[PDB]
Symmetry: D2
Subunit: 388 residues, 4 copies
C-alpha cells in the first residue's frame, strides 16, 4: 500500500527538467535558475537514482577551462554527498544561434566541424562522471522549406558525424554507447529521423551499428500520433532500447513534456507493462517540464508525481498479468498461438499442407470471435483498481 | 506547352482505383463494378503505361481453378490488345472476414498459414504476367487495444512470413522483389510498421534483406503528419525505393486517396523534384479513389488529372533547377557545402584543428543568414509559373 | 463495491451501435444483422434505459406503408415487453447514394426537398414513440474540393432546412427539440459545422433558436484534437447541451467509436465529473462500434463495458470532489476566486481603483504559484484509486 | 505581368512579425531588436499600407508616463513621414509572468482587474492613433490540467471582461470594434474559445454583440486540422469577419507562422478567392515570423513574399472565376442550384409536393454525377497557370 520510490527503482531526471525556468515561445521565465547542486540534493531527497545533463546545463557556454573545472568539482562533490549517479549525458547543439541550421547537418561545413568538437569534449566529460549512455537529440537538424536541405546529403553528413564519434570512442577504449532520440518536428518545421523507426533504420547504415541504439520519448512519438508502446516493442525486438525518456503528451501539438502519467494514461499503462515484462534494465529517465504556472514547490511535486505514477502503473500491470482470469482471457484471445511459429515445419511442408489452403475452412475461421473487448475491459478494471 | 502523357512516362494505376465503386464506412456504392478488361482499355487510351492488381481484383474470391484460368485469359488478351504492362502485383489480405485480426500476424496460427498460401499462389500469377515488384500492405496487422497483440511476437511472425516468401522466391528462381507499404492506422486502430522508417528498419532484420524495399504512399506518411519528400529521400539513400504510390491527402485524418496533386500541393512539387533528380526509374503508380460524388466520366477525368499534375510539376521542378538564379541562390544558402564531407581529413586532423573549436568564431558564424526564404520564394514563383 | 447499471442511470444505445455488422472501408461484415427486437431485449437485460434509431435502422429503405406499420408494431411490442424507452430519434441522410453530395445542402435542389420530406416523416414517427430529442448529423454536408461548395450558400440552405423543421414542429404542437451533432470530417473531406463551437454559433442565426441545441460526441471533437470537457462546458454555459454521445477515440484519425472509457481515459474522467456536477439530466447515450474482431459475445461485453466505465468514473469523480484535501487544494489554486466577479463594483470604480493598476504589485502577483500540479496529482490518485 | 504591391492593396504587418528576434522554446535570439521606427520605414518602402502593435511592442513594459509619450511621439512621426496607417491595435496579456494563468480568466481576481486596466489604457492609445479594430488574443486563457480551470466560471469571467470593455468603449463614444482571435492550443495545453466557431458562439452571449467579431488566423484553424476557407465563409455569413490574419502552416503541430502562401497552398488560393469574391474590405494583415535561420535581408524578403503571394493568387482566382469554361463547369456541378431556396413555396406546399417524396425518383437522382473532379482540375490548372 505504498508507492515510495527508492534509488533501486532507477529513476533519473535531467538537470534541464526541474531546472526549466518557464520561458516559452510567448512568455518570460516564471522561476529563477536552479543551482545544479541544489537540484541534485532535492532529487536525492525525493528518492531519485541520479541525474543527466547537457554540457551547457553544467558548464555555462563559454566558460574558461578554469571555471569549467570548478563547475565540475562542485557537481561531483554533490554526487558524492548524496550517492546520486550520472548514467547518461548529452550535448546542447540547439540553443546557441550558431546552430540555427543544425549542428551535424548544418549547411555550413565549419559549423559541422565545431559541432563534432563540442560533442567530443563532452563525451570525455561523460565517461569521467561514469555515464554509460551518450544521447544525441538533433533538434535543429531539418528544415522549414524543401529547397533548404538536400536530405540525402544531410543523411550522408549525419552518418559521417556518428561514424567519427564511433571511431573516437573505440580509439579511446571508452565503455559508452550512443542513443539517438527522435522527434518529428519543433523547433524545426520537420526534423530529420523523425520517429523511432527512422532512427532505427539509419543505425543499420552506420559503420559500427552495435554502438548505437535509440532513446525514444513518450511525447515525441505521440506528436506523430503513433503508438508509443508499439514503437518501444519494435526497439526491444531489435535489441536497440538503450535508454528511454518518460513523460506525458496530449496529442498532436507542441511538445508538452508533461509529467509521466499525465497525457495518455492508458498508453503509460501498456508502456509500463511492456518495460517490466521485457525486463528493461536501464534508467527510467524523466524528460518533463514542470508547467510555468508552478512555483518551486510545484516543481518538486511534479517530479515526485512522475515517480509515483510509474510505481502505481507498475503495480497495476503486475496484478493484471498475475490475474488467472487474465491468463485465461489471453488464451481465449490466442495470445499463446501468436507466439508459436507459423511454419516451423518449413516451406515445403507448408506448400504440401492442404489443411492450409485447399481444405481450409475460411468460414469457420472467420466466425471465431477474438474476445479482445473482454480482455481490454479486464485491463481497464485492473488499471482503475476496480477488479472485484 | 503540352502535358499529354505517353506510355514512356511509366504511369500506372491499380485496378482497385478507377474500379472503386464508392462504398465507404457510411454509405453504399454510387457506381457499378468495372470489368477489369474495360479498365485496361480506358486507361490505355488515357496514355497509361500499365495496371496493378490484387489477386482478388482479378479473380473473385472463391473462383474454381477453371473460372480462374478464364479470368486470367481475358485479362492477358486485353494487355496484348493494348500493349499495357503489369509491373506490380499484390495480395488482398484484408477484405475477407477471415483476416479481421490480420493475415501474417493473426493470433490464430491456421489463419497465418492460409495467408502465406494465398500470397504464394498470387506470386506465381504475378511472375507469369511479368511483374517485377510484389507489394505487401499489411492493412489488418495491428490492434485496437494493447493486450490483444504482443508486438514482439507479432514482429517475429511477420519476419517469419517474409523470410518464407523470400525462400520461396529464391527456390523458384523468380526475378521479383518485395516492397512493404507502410500505413499508420486504418482500418486497424494502430497498424504494425506504421511509417517508411519502421518498415526500413524491419527489413534489415530479414534473412535476405536485399530482396525487400518499401512502397511508400503519399497520403499514408501524411496521416502521421510526416514530410513525405524527406521519407522518400531516406528510402532512396538506403537503396530501398522499389516502388511508390502517388496520391493526395489533406492532413491527419482518414485515408483520403485523392488524385495526385490534390492535397498538399507543395509537397507534391518537392516530391517530383526529388524523384526526377534522383533518377527514380520505377513506375509512377497512382493509388487514388475517384470521389463517390463522381460518375464514370468523373472517374476518367480524375485518372487523367493524376498524370497531368505529375507532368506539370515535372516541368516546373526542372525549370526551377535549371534557373541560373536558382543555382546562385543554392550556393548562397550553401547547399554546395552540405554535399562536402565534414571531415575528409579524418578524426585526428579534426581533433588537432584549432580552427574547428579553440579559434572558431561562433559569433561570426551565427550572424550568417541562410537565405532560405528567398530560395523558397524562388521555388514558389517557379511552381506558380510567375517567374518574371 | 458494485458497478451494476440500472434503468435509473439513463444509459441508452443506438440500434446501429450493437447492430453494426463490421463492414468498414476495407472489409466485409464479420457479424450477421441483429433483429432490432433482439437488440432491445439484450440491452434491457444489461441494465440499459432505452434505445435510439435512425429511420432506416427500424424500417428498411423502401418499405411499403404496410411493412412499415409491421416493423413499428413489432418494435413497440418489444418496448412494452421490456419497459425500454426511446428518448431520441434521428434520420439517415447519408447511406443512400442519393445523398452522396448531402441532404440539406446537396447542390441538387430536388435532393434537398426529398431530404426534408424524409426527415419530417420520421419526426412524426419519433414523437409517436415518445422521443424528446431529434438529432441531426449532417455527415454528407461538406466537400472534398473547394469549388464544389459555396459555403455561404450552403449555410443559407442549412438554415433554411432547420427553420422549416422548426415551423413544422411548432405548427404541429409537438414537444420535441432538435440537437445538431458536429463532426469535423469523414465521410466528407471537410464537413460543415465541424465542431461544437460552429454548431452553437449557427444556432443563434436560426429563426427559433430556443428549439435547437447540440449533441456533441466524444470522439468527434477529439478528431480535431480539441478538449471535449471544455467544449461540453461551453455547451452547458450556453444552455444548449440537449443530448450527448459517449464513446472513446485515440487521437486525430478516422472516427473509431470505441466503447466509452477506452481512448483518452483522463478526458472521460473530467467529462463525467462535469456532467455530474452540472447536473446534466439527459440520456447518457453511447454511440460506439463493437470492433469487427468481435463475435456477438464480445458485442454484449463491449456494451456492458461502456456502462461499467461510466459508473466507475462517476464514483471516482464524486470521491475526488468530496475529498477535503481536494477542497483545500482547490482553494490553494484559487478556484474560489475564479467564481467571483472581477468587477462587481462596476467600470467606474475599477477605473478609479489604483490597486488595480497604478499601485498593483505585478512582481508579487507573478511569484505566486498556482499549485496546479499537486491538484492534478490528487486527481490522478483518485482516478486510480490510489488515495492513501 | 506585375505583382508589385501598393498601399491601396491594404497590406499590413504587426511590429512583432518582422521584429521577431528568433527566440524559440529551444534557442536564443538570432537577430537584434528592430526599432519600430525602422520597421515602419522598411515596410513602407516595400509597399505596405500600415502596421499593427501590441502595447508592449511600442512602449516597453514599465515605461514612465514620460518615456511613454516619447515612444509614441517618435512612432507617430514615422507614420507621418511615410503615410503609413495603424488600423488595428492589441494588448500583450501573455508575456509577463503575471499572466502565466491568464489575464481575463486568471484564477487570481486581482490579476484579472489589472488585465482590464492594462487593456483600457491601450484602447485609448489605439483610438488616438486611428485604429478601427482592437484585437483580443487570449493566448494564456486555458489550462494544462482539467481541475485547474472551471470552464463555465472562466467563460463568465471572459464575458464579464468583454462586457466591461464594451461599456467603456460606448461610454467614451469611441469608433472602434473588437475582434476575438481564436487559437486551439499553445502556449497553454488547451486554450479557451479554440476555433472560429467557439468565438462566434461566445459573441452572441455578450451584452452588445454588435461590437464584437472575429480575427481568424490561417495557421490557428489549421492547428485543429480545420478548413480555413470554410471557417472564414461561416464568419462572413454571420457578418463577423472584422479582420483577418494571413500566414502559412504545415499541418497540426506548433504554431509555425510561415509567410503567407507557404504551407497549404491550395487553401490559400480558395481563401483569396473567397475574400475577393465576398468583397472583404478590411486590412490584409500578415501575422508571420521570418524563420530564425534568416538575417535581416531574409526578413525583408519574407515580408515581401507574403504580399507577392497574395497578389499572385488574387490574379489566379480572378482568372478562374472569369473563365467561361469554369462558369460552365460550375453550372454542370449545380452551384447555381445551391444558391436557390429549397422551398420558397413554403412548408405546406412542400408537404403537398408529391414530386418531393412520393414520386421522387431516388435512383435517377443518385445516378447523377456531380462533375466535381473536372471542376477541381480546372481550378488546379488556373492556379498553376497551366490553362491552355
Ligand atoms: O537529447 C537531450 C535532450 O535535449 C533537449 O532537452 C530536448 O528537448 C530533449 O527532448 C532531449 O531529450
Ligand atoms: O498494397 C496494396 C494496396 O492494398 C489496398 O488497396 C490499400 O488500401 C492500398 O493502399 C495498397 O496500396
Ligand atoms: O446523428 C445520428 C448518428 O448518425 C450516424 O450513426 C453517425 O455515424 C453518428 O455519429 C450519429 O450520432
Ligand atoms: O492577437 C495579437 C497577437 O498576439 C500574439 O502576437 C499572437 O501570437 C498572435 O497570433 C496574435 O495575432
Amino acid at each position: 500500500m505504498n508507492y515510495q520510490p527508492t534509488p533501486e527503482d532507477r529513476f533519473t531526471f535531467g538537470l534541464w527538467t526541474v531546472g526549466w525556468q518557464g520561458r516559452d515561445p510567448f512568455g518570460d521565465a516564471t522561476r529563477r535558475a536552479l543551482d545544479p547542486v541544489e537540484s541534485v540534493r532535492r532529487l536525492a531527497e525525493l528518492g531519485a537514482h541520479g541525474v543527466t545533463f547537457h554540457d551547457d546545463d553544467l558548464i555555462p557556454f563559454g566558460s574558461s577551462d578554469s571555471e569549467r573545472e570548478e563547475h565540475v568539482k562542485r557537481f561531483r562533490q554533490a554526487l558524492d554527498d548524496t550517492g546520486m549517479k550520472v548514467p547518461m549525458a548529452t550535448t546542447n547543439l540547439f540553443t546557441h544561434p550558431v546552430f540555427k541550421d543544425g549542428g551535424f547537418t548544418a549547411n555550413d561545413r565549419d559549423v559541422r566541424r565545431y559541432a563534432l568538437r563540442k560533442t567530443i569534449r563532452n563525451i570525455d566529460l561523460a565517461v569521467e562522471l561514469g555515464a554509460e549512455t551518450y544521447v544525441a537529440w538533433g533538434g535543429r537538424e531539418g528544415a522549414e522549406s524543401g529547397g533548404a536541405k538536400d536530405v540525402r546529403d544531410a543523411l550522408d553528413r549525419m552518418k559521417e558525424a556518428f561514424d567519427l564519434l564511433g571511431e573516437y570512442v573505440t580509439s579511446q577504449g571508452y565503455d559508452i554507447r550512443f542513443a539517438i532520440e527522435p522527434k518529428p518536428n519543433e523547433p524545426r518545421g520537420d526534423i530529420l529521423l523523425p520517429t523511432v523507426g527512422h532512427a532505427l533504420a539509419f543505425i543499420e547504415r552506420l559503420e559500427r551499428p552495435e554502438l548505437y541504439g535509440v532513446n525514444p520519448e513518450v511525447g515525441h512519438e505521440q506528436m506523430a500520433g503513433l503508438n508509443f508502446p508499439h514503437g518501444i516493442a519494435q526497439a526491444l525486438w531489435a535489441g536497440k532500447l538503450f535508454h528511454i525518456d518518460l513523460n506525458g503528451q496530449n496529442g498532436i501539438k507542441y511538445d508538452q513534456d508533461l509529467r509521466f502519467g499525465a497525457g495518455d494514461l492508458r498508453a503509460a499503462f501498456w508502456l509500463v507493462d511492456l518495460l517490466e515484462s521485457a525486463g528493461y534494465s536501464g534508467p527510467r529517465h524523466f524528460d518533463f517540464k514542470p508547467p510555468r504556472t508552478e512555483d518551486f514547490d510545484g516543481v518538486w511535486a511534479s517530479a515526485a508525481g512522475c515517480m509515483r505514477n510509474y510505481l502505481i502503473l507498475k503495480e497495476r500491470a503486475a496484478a493484471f498479468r498475475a490475474d488467472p482470469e487474465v491468463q485465461e482471457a489471453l488464451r481465449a484471445s490466442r495470445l499463446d498461438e501468436l507466439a508459436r511459429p507459423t511454419a516451423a515445419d518449413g516451406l515445403q511442408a507448408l506448400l504440401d499442407d492442404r489443411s492450409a489452403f485447399e481444405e481450409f475452412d475460411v468460414d469457420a475461421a472467420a466466425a471465431r470471435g477474438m474476445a479482445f473487448e473482454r480482455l481490454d475491459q479486464l485491463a481497464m478494471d485492473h488499471l482503475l483498481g476496480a477488479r472485484g
